[PDB]
Coordinates of C-alpha atoms in Angstrom, one line a residue:
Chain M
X1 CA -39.7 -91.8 50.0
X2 CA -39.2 -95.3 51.6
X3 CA -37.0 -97.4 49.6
X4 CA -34.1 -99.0 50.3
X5 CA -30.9 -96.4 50.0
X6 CA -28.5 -98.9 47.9
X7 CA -31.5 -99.4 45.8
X8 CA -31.4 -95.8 44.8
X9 CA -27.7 -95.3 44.9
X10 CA -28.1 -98.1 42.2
X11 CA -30.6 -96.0 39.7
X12 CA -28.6 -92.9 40.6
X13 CA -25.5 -94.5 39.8
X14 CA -27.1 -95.9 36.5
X15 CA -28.3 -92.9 34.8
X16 CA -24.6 -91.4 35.6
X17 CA -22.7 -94.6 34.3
X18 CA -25.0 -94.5 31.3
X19 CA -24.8 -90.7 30.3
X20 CA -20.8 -91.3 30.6
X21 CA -20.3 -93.9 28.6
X22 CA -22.6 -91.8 25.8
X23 CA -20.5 -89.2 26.3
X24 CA -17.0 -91.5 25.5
X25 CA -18.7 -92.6 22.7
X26 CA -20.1 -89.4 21.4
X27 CA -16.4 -88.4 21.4
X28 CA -14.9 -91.4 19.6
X29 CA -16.9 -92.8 17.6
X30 CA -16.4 -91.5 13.9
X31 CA -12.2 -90.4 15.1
X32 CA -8.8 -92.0 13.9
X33 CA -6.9 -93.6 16.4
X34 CA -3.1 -95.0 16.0
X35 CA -2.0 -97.9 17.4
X36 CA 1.3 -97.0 18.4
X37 CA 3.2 -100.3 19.2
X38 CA 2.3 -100.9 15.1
X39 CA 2.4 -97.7 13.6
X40 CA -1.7 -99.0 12.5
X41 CA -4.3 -96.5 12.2
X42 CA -8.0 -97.1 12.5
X43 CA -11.4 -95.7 12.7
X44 CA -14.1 -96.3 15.8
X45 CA -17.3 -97.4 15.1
X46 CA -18.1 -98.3 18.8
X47 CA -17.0 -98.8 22.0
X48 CA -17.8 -102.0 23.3
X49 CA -18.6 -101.2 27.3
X50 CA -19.4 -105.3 27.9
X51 CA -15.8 -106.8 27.2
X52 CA -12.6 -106.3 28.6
X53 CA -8.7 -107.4 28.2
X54 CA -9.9 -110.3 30.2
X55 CA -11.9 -111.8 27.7
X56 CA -10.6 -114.0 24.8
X57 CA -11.3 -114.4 21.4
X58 CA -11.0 -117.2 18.8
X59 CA -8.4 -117.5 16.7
X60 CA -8.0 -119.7 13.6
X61 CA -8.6 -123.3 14.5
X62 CA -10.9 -122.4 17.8
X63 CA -7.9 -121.9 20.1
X64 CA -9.0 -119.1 22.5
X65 CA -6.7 -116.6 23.8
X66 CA -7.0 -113.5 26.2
X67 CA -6.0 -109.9 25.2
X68 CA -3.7 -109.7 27.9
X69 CA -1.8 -113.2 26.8
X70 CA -2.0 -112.2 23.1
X71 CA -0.4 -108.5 23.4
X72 CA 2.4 -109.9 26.1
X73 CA 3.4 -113.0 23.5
X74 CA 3.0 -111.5 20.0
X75 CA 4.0 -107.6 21.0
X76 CA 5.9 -108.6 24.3
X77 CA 3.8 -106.0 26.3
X78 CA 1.9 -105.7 29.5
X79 CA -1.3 -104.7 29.7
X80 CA -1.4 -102.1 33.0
X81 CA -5.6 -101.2 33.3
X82 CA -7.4 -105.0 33.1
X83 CA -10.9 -103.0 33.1
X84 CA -10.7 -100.5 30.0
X85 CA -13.1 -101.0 27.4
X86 CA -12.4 -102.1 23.8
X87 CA -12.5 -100.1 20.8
X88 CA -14.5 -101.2 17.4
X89 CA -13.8 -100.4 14.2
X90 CA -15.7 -102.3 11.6
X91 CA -14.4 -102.9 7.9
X92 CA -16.4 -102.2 4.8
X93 CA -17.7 -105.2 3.2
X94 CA -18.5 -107.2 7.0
X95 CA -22.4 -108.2 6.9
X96 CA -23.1 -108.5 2.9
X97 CA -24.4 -112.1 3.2
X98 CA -28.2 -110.7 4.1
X99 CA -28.3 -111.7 7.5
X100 CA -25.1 -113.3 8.4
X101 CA -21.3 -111.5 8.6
X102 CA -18.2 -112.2 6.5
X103 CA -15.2 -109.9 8.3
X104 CA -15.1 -110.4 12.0
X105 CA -14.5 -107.2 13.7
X106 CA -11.6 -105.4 15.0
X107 CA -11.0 -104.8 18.4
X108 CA -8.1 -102.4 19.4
X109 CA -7.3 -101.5 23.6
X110 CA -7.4 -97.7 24.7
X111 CA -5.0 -98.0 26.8
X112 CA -2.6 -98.6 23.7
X113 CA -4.5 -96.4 21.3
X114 CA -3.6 -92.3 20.7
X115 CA -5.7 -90.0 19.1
X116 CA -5.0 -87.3 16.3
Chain F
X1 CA -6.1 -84.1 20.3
X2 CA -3.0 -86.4 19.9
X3 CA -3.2 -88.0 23.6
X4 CA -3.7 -91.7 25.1
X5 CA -7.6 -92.8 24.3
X6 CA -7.5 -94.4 27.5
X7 CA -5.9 -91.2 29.6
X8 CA -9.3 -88.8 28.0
X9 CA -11.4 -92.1 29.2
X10 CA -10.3 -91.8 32.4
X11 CA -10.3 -87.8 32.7
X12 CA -13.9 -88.2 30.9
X13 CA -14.9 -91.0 33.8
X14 CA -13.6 -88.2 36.9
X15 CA -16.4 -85.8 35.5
X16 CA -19.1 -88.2 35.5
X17 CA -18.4 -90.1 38.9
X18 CA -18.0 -86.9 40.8
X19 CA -21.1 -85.7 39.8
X20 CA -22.8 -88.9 40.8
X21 CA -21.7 -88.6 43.9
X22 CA -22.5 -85.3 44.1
X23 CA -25.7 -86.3 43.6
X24 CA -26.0 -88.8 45.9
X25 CA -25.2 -87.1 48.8
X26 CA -27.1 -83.8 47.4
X27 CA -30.2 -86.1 47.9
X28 CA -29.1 -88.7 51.5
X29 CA -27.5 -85.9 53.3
X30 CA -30.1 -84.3 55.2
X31 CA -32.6 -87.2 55.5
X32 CA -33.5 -89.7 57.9
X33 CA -33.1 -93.7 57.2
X34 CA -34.3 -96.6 59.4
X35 CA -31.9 -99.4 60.0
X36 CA -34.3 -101.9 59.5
X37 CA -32.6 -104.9 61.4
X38 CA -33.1 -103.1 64.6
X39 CA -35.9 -100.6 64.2
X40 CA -33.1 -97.2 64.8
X41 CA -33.3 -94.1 62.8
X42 CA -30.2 -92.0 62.1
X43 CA -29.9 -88.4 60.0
X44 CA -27.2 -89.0 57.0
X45 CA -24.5 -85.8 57.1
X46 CA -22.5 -87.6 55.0
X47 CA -21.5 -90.2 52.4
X48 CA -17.9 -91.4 52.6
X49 CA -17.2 -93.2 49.3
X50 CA -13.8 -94.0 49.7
X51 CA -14.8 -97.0 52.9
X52 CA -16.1 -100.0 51.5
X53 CA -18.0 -102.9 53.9
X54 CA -14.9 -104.5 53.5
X55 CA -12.4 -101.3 55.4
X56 CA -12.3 -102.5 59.1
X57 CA -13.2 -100.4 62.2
X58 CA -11.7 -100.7 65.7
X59 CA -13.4 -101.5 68.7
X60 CA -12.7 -100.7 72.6
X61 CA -9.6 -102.5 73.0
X62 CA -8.0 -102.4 69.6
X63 CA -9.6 -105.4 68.1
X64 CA -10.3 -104.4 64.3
X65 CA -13.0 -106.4 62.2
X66 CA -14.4 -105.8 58.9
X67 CA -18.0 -104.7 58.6
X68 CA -19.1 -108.0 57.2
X69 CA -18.0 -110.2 59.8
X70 CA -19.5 -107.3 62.0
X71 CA -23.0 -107.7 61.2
X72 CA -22.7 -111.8 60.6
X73 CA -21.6 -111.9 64.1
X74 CA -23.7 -109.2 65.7
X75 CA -26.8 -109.4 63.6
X76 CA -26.5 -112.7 61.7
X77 CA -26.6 -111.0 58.3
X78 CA -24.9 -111.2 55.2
X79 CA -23.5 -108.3 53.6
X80 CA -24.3 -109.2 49.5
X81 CA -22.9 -105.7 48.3
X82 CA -19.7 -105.7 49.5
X83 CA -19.1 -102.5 47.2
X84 CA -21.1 -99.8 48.6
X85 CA -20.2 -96.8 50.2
X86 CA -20.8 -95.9 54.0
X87 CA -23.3 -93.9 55.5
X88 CA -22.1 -91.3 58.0
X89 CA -24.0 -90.0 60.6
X90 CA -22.3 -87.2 63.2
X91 CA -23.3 -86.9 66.7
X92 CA -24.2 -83.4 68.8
X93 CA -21.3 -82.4 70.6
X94 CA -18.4 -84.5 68.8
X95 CA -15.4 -82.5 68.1
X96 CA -15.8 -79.8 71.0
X97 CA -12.4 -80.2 72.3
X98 CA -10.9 -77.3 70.1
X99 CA -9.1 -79.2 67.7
X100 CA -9.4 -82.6 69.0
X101 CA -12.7 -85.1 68.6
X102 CA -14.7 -86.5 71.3
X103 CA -17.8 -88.8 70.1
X104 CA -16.5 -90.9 67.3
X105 CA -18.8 -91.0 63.8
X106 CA -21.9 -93.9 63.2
X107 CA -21.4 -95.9 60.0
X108 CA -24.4 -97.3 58.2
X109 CA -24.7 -99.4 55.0
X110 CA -26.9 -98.1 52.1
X111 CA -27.9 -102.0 51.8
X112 CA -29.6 -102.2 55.5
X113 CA -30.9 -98.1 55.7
X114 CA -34.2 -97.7 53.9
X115 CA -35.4 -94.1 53.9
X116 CA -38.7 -92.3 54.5

């Protein structure tokens, strides 16, 4: 059926991509994981698919930070896989304020995540 | 299952990205596409997803160059997907030579074949 073939590699590829990350999901969300390097232990909510080790957050006073800068200088270790996912687990009493949140959200890396 | 989050992720991924593939080719091999920048038509035998627009080729005298500058040069285009697999297309009477190969293999990018 006439169509340009990357154009349905891309659907193809879609529905595949999509039906895999369900499936990560489907088998993490709701288990406890333990950060090793802290002897932690948490629960995931959600896997977020859209962020990655690359991205930063905001600390205290606004000053922005990448995952892979703030595990090398407060836990002295190197991130290996730059394109993993991050876990989610959220805490108990985070929305509350109808409408806005109040606890942030807590993002842990797979790559330094074990399960049970 | 005490094991590395990431390690299942990536077992997990295998799974899912060989069957898209599988699925791929299950529906291009076989099946006739139209290079539309010069009106050819070739029968796809097979995908190989491990070349990439960027993977070079060699030419009569040993000269390599990379599939993008390829069709810039030859054809005035601009690969945008530089990401995709390549298309392979076998000739009639290519390996022969008991062991050996004769005829080389055609290459085609999903992003200039449309099919039919």
């Amino acid at each position: 059926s006439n169509d340009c073939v990357l154009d349905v590699m891309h659907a193809i590829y879609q529905q595949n991509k999509e039906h895999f990350q369900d499936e990560c999901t489907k088998l993490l969300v709701g288990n406890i994981v333990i950060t090793r390097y802290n002897n932690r232990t948490y629960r995931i909510d959600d896997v977020d698919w859209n962020k990655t080790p690359k991205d930063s957050f905001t600390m205290s006073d606004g000053k922005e930070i990448t995952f892979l800068e703030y595990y090398s200088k407060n836990y002295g270790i190197t991130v290996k896989e730059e394109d993993q996912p991050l876990l989610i687990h959220r805490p108990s009493e985070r929305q509350d304020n109808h409408g806005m949140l109040l606890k942030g959200e807590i993002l842990l890396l797979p790559e330094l995540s074990f399960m049970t």
